[PDB]
Short mmCIF file of C-alpha atoms in Angstrom, two decimals:
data_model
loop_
_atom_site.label_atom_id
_atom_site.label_comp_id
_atom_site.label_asym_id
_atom_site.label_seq_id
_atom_site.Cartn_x
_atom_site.Cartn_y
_atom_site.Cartn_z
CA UNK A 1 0.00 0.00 0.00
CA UNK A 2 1.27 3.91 -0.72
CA UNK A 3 -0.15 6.72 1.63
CA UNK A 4 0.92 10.38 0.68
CA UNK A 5 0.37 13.19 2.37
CA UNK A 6 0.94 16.36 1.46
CA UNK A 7 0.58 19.07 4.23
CA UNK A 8 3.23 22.32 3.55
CA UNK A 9 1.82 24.77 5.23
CA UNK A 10 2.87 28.99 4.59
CA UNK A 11 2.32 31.96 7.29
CA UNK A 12 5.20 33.80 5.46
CA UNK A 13 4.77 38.02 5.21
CA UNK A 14 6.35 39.89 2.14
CA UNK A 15 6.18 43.56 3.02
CA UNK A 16 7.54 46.50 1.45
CA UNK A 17 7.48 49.94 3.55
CA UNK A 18 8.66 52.44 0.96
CA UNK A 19 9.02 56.36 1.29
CA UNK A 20 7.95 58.51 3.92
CA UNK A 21 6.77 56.49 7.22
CA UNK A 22 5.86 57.11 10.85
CA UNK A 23 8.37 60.68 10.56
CA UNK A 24 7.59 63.88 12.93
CA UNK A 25 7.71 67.56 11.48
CA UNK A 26 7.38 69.68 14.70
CA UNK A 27 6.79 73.46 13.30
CA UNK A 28 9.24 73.07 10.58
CA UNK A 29 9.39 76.53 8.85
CA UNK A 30 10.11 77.54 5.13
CA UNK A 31 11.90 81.24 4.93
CA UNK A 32 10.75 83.82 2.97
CA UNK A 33 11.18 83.22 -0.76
CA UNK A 34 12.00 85.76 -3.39
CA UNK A 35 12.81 85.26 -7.50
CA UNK A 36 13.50 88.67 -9.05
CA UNK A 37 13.91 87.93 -12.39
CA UNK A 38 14.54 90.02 -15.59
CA UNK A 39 15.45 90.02 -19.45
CA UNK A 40 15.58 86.27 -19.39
CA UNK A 41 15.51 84.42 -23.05
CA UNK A 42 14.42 80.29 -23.01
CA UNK A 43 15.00 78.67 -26.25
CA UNK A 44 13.88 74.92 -25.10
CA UNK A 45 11.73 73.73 -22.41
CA UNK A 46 11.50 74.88 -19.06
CA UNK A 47 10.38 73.04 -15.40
CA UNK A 48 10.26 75.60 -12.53
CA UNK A 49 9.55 75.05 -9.12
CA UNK A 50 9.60 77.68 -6.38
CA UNK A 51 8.70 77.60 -2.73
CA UNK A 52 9.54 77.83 0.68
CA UNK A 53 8.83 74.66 2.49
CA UNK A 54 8.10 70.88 0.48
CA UNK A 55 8.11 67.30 1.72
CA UNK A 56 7.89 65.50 -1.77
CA UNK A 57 7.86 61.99 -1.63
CA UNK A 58 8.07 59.53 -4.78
CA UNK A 59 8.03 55.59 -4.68
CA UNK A 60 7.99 53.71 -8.23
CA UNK A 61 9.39 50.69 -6.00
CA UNK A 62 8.61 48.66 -2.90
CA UNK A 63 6.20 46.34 -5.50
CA UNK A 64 6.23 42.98 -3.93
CA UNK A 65 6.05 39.55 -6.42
CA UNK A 66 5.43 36.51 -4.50
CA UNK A 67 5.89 32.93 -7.19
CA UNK A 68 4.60 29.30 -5.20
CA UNK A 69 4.48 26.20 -7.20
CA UNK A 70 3.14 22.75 -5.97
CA UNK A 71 3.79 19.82 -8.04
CA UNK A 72 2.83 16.09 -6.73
CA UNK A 73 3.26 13.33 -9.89
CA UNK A 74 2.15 10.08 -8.96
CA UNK A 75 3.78 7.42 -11.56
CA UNK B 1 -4.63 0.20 -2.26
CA UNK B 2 -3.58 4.00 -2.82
CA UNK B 3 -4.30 7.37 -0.62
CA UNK B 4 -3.73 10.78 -1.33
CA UNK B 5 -4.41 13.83 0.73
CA UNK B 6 -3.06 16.89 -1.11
CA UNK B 7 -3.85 19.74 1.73
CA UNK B 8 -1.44 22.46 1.90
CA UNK B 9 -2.24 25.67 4.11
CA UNK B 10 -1.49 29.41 2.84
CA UNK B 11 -1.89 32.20 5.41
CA UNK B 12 0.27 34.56 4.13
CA UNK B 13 0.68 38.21 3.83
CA UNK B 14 1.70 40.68 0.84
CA UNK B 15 1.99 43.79 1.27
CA UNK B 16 2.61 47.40 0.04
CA UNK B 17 3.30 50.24 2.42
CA UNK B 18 4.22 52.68 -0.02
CA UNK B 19 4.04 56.66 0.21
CA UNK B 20 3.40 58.77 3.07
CA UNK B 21 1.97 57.07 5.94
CA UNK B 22 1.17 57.53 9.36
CA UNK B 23 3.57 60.80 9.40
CA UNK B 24 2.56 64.53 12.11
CA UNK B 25 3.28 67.33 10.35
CA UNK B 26 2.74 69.65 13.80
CA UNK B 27 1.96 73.56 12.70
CA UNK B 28 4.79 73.20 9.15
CA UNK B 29 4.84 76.71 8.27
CA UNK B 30 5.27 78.07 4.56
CA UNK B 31 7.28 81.07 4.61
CA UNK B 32 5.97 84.38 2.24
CA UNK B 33 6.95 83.69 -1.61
CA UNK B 34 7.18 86.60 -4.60
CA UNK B 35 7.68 85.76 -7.97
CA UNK B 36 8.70 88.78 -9.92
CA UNK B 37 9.37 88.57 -13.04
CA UNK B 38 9.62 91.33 -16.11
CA UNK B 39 10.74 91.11 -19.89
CA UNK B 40 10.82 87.57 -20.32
CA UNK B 41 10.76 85.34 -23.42
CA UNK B 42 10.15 81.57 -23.61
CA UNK B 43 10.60 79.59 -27.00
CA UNK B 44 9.33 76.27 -25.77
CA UNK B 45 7.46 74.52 -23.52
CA UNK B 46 7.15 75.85 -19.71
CA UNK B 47 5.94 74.06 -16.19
CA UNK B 48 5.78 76.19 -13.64
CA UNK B 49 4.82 75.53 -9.88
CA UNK B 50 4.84 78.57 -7.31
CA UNK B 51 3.36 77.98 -3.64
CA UNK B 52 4.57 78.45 -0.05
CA UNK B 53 3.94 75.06 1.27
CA UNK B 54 3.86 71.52 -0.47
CA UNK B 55 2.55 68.27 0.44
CA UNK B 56 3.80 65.81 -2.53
CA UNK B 57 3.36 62.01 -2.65
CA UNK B 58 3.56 60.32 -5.97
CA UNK B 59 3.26 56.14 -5.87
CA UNK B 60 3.51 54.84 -9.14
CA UNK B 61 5.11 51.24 -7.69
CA UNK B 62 3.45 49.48 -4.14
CA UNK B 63 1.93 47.12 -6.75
CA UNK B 64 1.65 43.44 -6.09
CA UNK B 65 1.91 40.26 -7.87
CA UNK B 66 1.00 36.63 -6.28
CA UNK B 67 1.02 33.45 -8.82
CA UNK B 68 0.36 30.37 -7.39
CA UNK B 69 0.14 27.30 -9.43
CA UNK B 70 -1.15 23.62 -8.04
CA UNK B 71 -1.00 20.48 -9.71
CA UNK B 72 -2.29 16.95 -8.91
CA UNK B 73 -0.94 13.87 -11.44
CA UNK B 74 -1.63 10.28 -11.13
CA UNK B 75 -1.15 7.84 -13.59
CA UNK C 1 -8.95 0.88 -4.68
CA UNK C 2 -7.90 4.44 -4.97
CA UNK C 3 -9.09 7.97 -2.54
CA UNK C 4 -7.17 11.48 -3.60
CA UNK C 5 -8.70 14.11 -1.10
CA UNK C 6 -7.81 17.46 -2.90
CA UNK C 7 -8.32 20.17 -0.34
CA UNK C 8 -5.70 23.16 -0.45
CA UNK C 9 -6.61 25.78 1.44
CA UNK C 10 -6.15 29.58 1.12
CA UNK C 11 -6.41 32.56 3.85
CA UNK C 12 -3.58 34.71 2.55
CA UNK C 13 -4.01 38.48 1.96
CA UNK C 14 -2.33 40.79 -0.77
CA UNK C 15 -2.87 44.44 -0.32
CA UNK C 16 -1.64 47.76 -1.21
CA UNK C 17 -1.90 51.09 0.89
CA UNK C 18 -0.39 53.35 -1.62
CA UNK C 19 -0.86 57.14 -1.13
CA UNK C 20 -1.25 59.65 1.71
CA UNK C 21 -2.50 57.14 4.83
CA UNK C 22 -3.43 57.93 8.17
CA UNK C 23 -1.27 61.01 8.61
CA UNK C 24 -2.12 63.94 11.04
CA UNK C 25 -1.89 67.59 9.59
CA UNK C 26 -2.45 70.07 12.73
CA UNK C 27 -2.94 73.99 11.75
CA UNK C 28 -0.68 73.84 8.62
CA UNK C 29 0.36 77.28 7.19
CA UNK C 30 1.02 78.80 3.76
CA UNK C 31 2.64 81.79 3.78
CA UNK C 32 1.58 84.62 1.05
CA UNK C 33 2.28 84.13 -2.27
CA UNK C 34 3.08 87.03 -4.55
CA UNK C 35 3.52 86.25 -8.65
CA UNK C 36 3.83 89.55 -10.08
CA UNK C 37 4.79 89.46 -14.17
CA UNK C 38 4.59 91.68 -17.05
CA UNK C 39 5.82 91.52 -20.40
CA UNK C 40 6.42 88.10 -20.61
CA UNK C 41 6.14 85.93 -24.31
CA UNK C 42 5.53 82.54 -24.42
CA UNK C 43 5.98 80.84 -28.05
CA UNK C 44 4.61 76.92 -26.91
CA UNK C 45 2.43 75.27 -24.05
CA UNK C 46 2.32 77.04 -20.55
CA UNK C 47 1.18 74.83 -17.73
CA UNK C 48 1.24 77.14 -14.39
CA UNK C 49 -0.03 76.29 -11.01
CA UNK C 50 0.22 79.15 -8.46
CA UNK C 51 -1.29 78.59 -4.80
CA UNK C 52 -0.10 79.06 -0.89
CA UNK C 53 -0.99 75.79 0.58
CA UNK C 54 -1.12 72.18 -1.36
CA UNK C 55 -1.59 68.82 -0.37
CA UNK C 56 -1.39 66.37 -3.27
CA UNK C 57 -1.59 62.57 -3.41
CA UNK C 58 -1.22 60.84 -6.85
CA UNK C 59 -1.37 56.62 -7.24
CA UNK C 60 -0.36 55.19 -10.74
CA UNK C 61 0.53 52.07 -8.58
CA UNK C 62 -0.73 50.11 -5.94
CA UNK C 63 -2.28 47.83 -8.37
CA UNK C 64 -2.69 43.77 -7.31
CA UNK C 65 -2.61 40.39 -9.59
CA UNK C 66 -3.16 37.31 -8.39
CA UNK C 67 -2.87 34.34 -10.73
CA UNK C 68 -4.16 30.79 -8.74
CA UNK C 69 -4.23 27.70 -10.80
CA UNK C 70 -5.51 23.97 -9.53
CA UNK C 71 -4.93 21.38 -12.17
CA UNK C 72 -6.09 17.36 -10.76
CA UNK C 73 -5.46 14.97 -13.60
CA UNK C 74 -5.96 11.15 -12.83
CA UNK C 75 -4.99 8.89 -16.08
CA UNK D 1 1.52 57.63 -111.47
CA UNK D 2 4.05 59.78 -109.96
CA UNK D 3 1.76 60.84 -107.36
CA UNK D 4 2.47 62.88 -103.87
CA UNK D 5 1.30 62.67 -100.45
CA UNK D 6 1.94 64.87 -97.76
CA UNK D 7 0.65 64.56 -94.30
CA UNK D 8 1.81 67.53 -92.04
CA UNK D 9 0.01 66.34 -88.17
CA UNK D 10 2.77 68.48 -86.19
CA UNK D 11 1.58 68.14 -82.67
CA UNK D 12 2.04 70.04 -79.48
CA UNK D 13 0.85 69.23 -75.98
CA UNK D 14 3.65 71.66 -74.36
CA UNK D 15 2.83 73.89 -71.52
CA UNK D 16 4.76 77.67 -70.76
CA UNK D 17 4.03 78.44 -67.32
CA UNK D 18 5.08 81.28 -64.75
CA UNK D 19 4.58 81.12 -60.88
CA UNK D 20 5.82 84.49 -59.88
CA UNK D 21 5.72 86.21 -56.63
CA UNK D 22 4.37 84.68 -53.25
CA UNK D 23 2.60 81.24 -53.81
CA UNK D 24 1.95 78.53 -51.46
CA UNK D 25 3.43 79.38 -48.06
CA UNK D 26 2.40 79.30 -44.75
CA UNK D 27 2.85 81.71 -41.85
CA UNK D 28 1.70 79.98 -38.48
CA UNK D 29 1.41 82.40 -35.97
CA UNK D 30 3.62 85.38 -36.83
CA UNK D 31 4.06 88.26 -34.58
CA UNK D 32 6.16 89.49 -31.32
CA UNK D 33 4.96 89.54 -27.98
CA UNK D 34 5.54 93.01 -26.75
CA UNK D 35 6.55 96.30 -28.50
CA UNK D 36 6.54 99.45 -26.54
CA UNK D 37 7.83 103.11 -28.09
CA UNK D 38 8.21 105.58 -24.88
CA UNK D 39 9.14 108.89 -25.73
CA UNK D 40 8.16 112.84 -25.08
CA UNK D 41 7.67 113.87 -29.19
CA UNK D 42 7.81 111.57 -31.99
CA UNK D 43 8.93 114.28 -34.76
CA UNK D 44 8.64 112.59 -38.46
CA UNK D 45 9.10 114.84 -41.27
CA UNK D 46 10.13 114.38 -45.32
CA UNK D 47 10.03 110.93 -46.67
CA UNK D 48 9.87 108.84 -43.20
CA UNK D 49 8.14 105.50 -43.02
CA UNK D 50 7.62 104.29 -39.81
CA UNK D 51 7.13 100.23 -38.68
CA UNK D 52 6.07 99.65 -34.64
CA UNK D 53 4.87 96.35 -34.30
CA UNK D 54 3.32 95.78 -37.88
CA UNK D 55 3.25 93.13 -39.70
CA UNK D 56 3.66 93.56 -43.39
CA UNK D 57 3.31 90.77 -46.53
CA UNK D 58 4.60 92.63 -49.62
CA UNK D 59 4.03 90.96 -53.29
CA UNK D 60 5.62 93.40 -56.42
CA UNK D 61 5.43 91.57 -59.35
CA UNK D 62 6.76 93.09 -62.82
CA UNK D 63 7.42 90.46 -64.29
CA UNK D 64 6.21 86.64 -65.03
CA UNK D 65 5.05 87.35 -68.75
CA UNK D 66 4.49 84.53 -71.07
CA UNK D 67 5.28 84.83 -74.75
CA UNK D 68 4.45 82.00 -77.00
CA UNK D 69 5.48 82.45 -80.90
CA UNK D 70 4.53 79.09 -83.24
CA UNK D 71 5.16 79.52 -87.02
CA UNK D 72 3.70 76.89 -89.73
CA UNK D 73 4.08 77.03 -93.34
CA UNK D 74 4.17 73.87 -95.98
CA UNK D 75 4.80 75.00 -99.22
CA UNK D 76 4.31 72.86 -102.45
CA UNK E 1 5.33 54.15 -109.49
CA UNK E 2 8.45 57.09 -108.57
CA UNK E 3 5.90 58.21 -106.08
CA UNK E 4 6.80 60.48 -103.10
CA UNK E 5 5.25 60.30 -99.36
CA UNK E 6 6.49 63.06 -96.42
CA UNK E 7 4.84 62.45 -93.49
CA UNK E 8 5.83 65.49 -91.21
CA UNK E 9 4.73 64.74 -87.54
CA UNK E 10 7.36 65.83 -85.01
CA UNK E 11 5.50 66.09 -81.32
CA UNK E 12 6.07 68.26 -78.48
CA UNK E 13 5.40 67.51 -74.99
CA UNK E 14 7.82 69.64 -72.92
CA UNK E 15 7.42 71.99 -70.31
CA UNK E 16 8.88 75.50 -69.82
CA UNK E 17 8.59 76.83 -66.34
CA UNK E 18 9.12 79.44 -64.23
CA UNK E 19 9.15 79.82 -60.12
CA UNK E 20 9.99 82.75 -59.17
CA UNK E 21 10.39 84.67 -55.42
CA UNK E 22 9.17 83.43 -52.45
CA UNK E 23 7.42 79.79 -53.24
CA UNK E 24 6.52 77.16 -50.25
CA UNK E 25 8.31 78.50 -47.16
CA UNK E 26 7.20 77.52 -43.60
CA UNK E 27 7.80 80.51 -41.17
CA UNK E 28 6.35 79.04 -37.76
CA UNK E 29 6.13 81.64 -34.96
CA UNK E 30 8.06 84.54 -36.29
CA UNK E 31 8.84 87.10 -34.21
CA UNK E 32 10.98 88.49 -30.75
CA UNK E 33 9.93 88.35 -27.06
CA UNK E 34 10.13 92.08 -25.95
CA UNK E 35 11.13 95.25 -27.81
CA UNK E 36 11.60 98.59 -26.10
CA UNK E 37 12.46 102.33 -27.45
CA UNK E 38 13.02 104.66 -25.12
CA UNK E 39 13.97 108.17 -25.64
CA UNK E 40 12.63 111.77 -24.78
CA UNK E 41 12.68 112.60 -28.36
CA UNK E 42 12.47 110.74 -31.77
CA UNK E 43 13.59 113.07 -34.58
CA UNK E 44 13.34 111.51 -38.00
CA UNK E 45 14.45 113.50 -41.32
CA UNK E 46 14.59 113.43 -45.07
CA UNK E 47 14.34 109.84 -46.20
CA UNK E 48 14.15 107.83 -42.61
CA UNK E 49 12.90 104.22 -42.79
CA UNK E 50 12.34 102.81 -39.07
CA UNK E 51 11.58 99.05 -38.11
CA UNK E 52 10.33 98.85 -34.48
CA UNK E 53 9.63 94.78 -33.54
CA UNK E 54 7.37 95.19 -36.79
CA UNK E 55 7.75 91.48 -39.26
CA UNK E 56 8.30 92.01 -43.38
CA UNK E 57 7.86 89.73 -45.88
CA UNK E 58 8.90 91.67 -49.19
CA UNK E 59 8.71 89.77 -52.21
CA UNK E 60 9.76 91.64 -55.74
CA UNK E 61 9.62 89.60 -59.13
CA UNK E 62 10.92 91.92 -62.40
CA UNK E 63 11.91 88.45 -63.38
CA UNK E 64 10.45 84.71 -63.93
CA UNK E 65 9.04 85.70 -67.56
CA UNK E 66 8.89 82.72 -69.88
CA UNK E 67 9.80 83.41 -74.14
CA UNK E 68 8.92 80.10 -77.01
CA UNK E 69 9.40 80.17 -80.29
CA UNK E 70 8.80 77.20 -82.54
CA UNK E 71 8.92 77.22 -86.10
CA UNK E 72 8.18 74.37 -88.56
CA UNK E 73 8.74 74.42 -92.45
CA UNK E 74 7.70 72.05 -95.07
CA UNK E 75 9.11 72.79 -98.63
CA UNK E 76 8.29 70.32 -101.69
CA UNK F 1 10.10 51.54 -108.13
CA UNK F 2 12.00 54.40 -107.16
CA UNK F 3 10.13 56.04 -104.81
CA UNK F 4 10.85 58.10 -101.84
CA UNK F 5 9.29 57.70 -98.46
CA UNK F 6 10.42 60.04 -95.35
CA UNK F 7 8.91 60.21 -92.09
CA UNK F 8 9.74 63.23 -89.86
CA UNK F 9 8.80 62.39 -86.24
CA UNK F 10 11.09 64.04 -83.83
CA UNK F 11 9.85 64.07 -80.17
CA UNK F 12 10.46 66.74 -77.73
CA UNK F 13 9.61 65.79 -73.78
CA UNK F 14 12.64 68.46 -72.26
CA UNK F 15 11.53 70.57 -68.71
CA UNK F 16 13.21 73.72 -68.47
CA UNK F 17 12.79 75.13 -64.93
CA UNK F 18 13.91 77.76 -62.79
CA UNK F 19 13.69 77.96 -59.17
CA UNK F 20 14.66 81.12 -58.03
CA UNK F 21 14.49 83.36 -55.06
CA UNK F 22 13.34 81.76 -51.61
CA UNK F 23 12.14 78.24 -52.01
CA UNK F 24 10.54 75.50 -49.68
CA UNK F 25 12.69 77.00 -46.80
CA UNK F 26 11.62 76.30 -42.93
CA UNK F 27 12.20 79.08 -40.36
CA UNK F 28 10.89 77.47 -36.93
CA UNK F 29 10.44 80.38 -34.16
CA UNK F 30 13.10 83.39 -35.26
CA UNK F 31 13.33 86.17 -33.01
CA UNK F 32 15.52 87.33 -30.20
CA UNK F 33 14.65 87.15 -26.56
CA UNK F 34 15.03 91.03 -25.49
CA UNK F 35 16.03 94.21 -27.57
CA UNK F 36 16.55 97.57 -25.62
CA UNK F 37 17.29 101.33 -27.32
CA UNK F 38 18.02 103.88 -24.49
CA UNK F 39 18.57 107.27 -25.28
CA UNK F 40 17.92 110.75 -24.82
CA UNK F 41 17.24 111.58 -28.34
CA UNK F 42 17.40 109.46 -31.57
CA UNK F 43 17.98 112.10 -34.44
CA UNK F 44 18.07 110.34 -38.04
CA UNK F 45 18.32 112.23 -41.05
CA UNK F 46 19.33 112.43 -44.67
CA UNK F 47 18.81 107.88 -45.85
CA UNK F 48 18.72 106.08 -42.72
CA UNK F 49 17.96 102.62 -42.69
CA UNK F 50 17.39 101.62 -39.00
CA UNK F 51 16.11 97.74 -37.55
CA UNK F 52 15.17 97.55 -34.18
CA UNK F 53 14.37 93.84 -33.54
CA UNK F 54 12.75 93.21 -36.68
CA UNK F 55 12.41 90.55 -38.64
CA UNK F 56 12.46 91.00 -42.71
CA UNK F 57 12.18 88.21 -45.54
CA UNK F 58 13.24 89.82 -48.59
CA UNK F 59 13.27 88.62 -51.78
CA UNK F 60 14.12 90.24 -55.29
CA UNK F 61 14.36 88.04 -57.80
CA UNK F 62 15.42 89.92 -61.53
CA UNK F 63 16.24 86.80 -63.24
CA UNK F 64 14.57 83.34 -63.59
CA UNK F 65 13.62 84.01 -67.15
CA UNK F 66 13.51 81.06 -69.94
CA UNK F 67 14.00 81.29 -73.52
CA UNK F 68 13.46 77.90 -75.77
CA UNK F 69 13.96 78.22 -79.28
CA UNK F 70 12.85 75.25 -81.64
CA UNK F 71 13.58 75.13 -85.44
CA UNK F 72 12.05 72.50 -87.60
CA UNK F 73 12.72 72.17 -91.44
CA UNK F 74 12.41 69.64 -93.89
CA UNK F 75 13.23 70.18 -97.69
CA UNK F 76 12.75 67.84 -100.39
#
């Protein structure tokens, strides 16, 4: 006679905590800002930011991939 | 005679924790911003962003993928 | 005689909290803001956001697949 | 007999053409942003032209005349 | 017999053509950001031409004129 | 016999062209960023020719002419 059991068993965590977690900002202050600007010639594109306090955060990661394969072949 | 007992147990955990999370910002403060600007010329394309205080949180990633195949053969 | 008892079991969890979670923002401040401008060309596109106080949260990501596959093949 | 024949079937499918002056262009968008003359007088006097901020399309054309001489004679 | 046969058919399909001054020209956004005169006084005298930020297209064609002569003789 | 059989049939498919002056040309966004003139006084007199951030496309074009002369004879 042939008894199989098959019993794996899978509490297993995959976690990804990306950017900006659990931080404190107690009365963080920006100074005063000022651009004068004058007789200024672009020829090609232009990004502008300006300001006195930012908390930017950017996550294109942390994606979690998670791959489980269970093969049994009896004869 | 022949027995098979294909059981296996999955309790697990993916996850993402991506961006800004569970963060005190406690009275932040923007400071006062001028722009001035005269006589200016721009050939192309502009972005412009102009503010005293930024909050910012871009996620493109955090995504999750979970493949999980199961096969059985006998005979 | 043959018995195959197929019972996998699944309690697992996939998730994504992508974005701006659970975060406290007490009496937050933008200073003034100020854009003064004249005589200004622009020859292309102009995308301009002017403001004292922002809070933005934008989520490409955070997406979730899950692929499950049971195959039992006797003979 | 000593006869003749004469078939004269000259033929002409020729074209003269002239395309003078200011055909088929394009002007997207012309023009400055800002023109600004500041002054106390502005004194013009005797054969003065005076341009602020114009925009001008000019065509002199003179020329492009077509002359088309053809000359047939058979003579027996 | 000492018969004679003249078959005169010559054939013309060509072109003369002329293209003359400003043909098929893109001009995309012509012009400058900002311009400023400043003065207390413009004085302008006896034959004066003045551009100020102003766009010309001048186009002048004396030219591009098109002369054919064709002659055809047939003499038995 | 001695007869006499003669077939004129010259063809003519020739192009003559000009292309003169200011042809199929691209100008993507001319112009300069700023242009300033501070004075007290501008005083022009007697053939002045002044530019002030303009822009000017000028074109003269005197020639471009064709001349096609065709002869044809045939004497028996």
């Amino acid at each position: 006679s042939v008894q199989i059991v098959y019993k794996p068993v899978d509490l297993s965590k995959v976690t990804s905590k990306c950017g900006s977690l659990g931080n404190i900002h107690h009365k963080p202050g920006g100074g005063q800002v000022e651009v004068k600007s004058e007789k200024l010639d672009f020829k090609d594109r232009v990004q502008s930011k300006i300001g006195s306090l930012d908390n930017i955060t950017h996550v294109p990661g942390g994606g979690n991939k998670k791959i489980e394969t269970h093969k049994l072949t009896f004869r």
